[PDB]
Amino acid sequence: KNFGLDVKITGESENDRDLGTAPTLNDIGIDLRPWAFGQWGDWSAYFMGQAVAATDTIETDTPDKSYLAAREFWVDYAGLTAYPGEHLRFGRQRLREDSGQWQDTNIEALNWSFETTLLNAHAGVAQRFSEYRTDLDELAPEDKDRTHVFGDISTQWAPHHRIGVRIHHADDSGHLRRPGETYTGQLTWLGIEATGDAYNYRSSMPLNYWASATWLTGDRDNLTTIATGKQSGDVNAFGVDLGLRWNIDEQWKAGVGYARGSGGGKDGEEQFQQTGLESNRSNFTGTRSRVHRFGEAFRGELSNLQAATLFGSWQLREDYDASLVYHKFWRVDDDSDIGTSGINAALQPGEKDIGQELDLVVTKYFKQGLLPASMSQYVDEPSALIRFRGGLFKPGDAYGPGTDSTMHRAFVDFIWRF
Ligand SMILES: CCCCCCC/C=C\CCCCCC(=O)OC[C@H](O)CO
Ligand SMILES: CCCCCCC/C=C\CCCCCC(=O)OC[C@H](O)CO
Ligand SMILES: CCCCCCC/C=C\CCCCCC(=O)OC[C@H](O)CO
Ligand SMILES: [Ca+2]
């Protein structure tokens, strides 16, 4: 198929991102994604654009109310080897791994993929140079002049069981403001990961699991503030994520998860953070729909954060699925921030209890708009669908007096493909 058009109508309700402390969303929008694909022997090329119009600045994809954008544009060469799962891709492209915790984003990259039955491997380099959007003229400061280089290798050591290692390096080439006029880093994540159909919603096994452990090292120049100077320090942090899923039958599943990113230490030196390319969204509940690993509402980054998780899920053939997820969150170090949550409000010193969340995702998949698993737009939308995604967050003692007791973020997406 050489071209198509994705049409999405989205409503978003958000209340209240700052828990009532500062001066919400209740809005609707349309999202149009024309795409083009060509293939000629070992060569191929792809483009997807995006046009959005909304009643306010809503999230239509996991600024002005309306804008145009270039989502993906790449050329691909598959001829280095005869293995069909092996190819080299150049351009702004979808980078993804199954957990979503290392990379899950569209970014300018050169990425080599090698995927066979017994051995998987990948290697790439990436950097943002623009938003390619009509409404945003500049890059985020964290992204400006930051280069990513990464790789992984893994093998299937038994049927349905994979073991692997993964590396990522981020280098900041920018400079901090001189005194009188938030950080630059060189950071390396080195991870091991074991999975037993962790993200395979079609598993034939009665039990599935994931386990991963990641060591973060390198250093950060933190700007102190008008700037007054800089603090440098080595980083030596550690992250872990574990989960177990019971495949009760063809339809019912349930499971438990635990994750922890280290925190604090002298000037935040024992503070884990993620690569900045992660989405934290995955099929961990065992359905075709991806779920935010740390809540649709809270949207935690694994950083001075401990989370315990429980979920249940239901699906009927390829027609429906649904998931219900509960999370409880604690800070690891009670005098340090958690960073990168879906909540913009200050924490009270000495309190670890971040809060609790309940999530619900419900999807009906329509017969029209079926895609090949090859496309990058198949992970989120395998065909037309209608989906509700909602999260209810109850702030704990760490947020303290005069904050709302409850906050929610909910979405409906209706998607039709031509
Ligand atoms: C530096 C990155 C380079 C990325 C190249 C981006 C190209 C984006 C889309 C190219 C679309 C390719 C199909 C269109 C085309 O070339 O014509 C082919 C015929 O129409 C069909 O055989
Ligand atoms: C493949 C394993 C699947 C297991 C999933 C759920 C695992 C839940 C707990 C395992 C151990 C986690 C420790 C929980 C805990 O409170 O530890 C204390 C922290 O280390 C304090 O920082
Ligand atoms: C089967 C469980 C159903 C609920 C699961 C997760 C909840 C998902 C969406 C909650 C719907 C909106 C709740 C409204 C609410 O509690 O807060 C209102 C304001 O946001 C309070 O600031
Ligand atoms: Ca507000």
Numbering used by the authors: 40 to 62, 65 to 103, 121 to 239, 247 to 290, 298 to 490
Reproduce passages from the article.
In the periplasm, M is randomly epimerized to G or partially acetylated, and the mature alginate is directed to the transmembrane β-barrel protein AlgE in the outer membrane for conveyance to the extracellular space. Briefly, the structures include 18 antiparallel strands (S1–S18) that cross the membrane to varying degrees, nine extracellular loops (L1–L9) and eight periplasmic turns (T1–T8). The loops and turns range in size from two to 43 residues, with L1 coordinating a calcium ion. Both the N- and C-termini are in the periplasm. The cavity within the AlgE barrel has been proposed to act as a pore for alginate, a random, linear copolymer of 1,4-linked β-d-mannuronic acid (M) and its C-5 epimer α-l-guluronic acid (G).
The best crystals were obtained with 7.8 MAG at 20°C. These yielded three crystal forms in space groups C2, P212121, P21 that diffracted to 1.9, 2.4 and 2.8 Å resolution, respectively. In contrast, the asymmetric units of AlgE-2.4 and AlgE-2.8 contain two molecules (molecules A and B). For all in meso structures, type I packing was observed, as is the norm for crystals grown in a lipidic mesophase environment. Interestingly, we find that L2 and T8, while ordered in some crystal forms, are disordered in others. Disorder, where electron density is either not observed or is ill-defined in the map, suggests that the corresponding loops, or parts thereof, are flexible and, in certain cases, may have relocated to reside outside the barrel. It appears therefore that in this collection of six models we have an ensemble of structures that map a conformational landscape for alginate transport. We refer to this as the double-gate model.
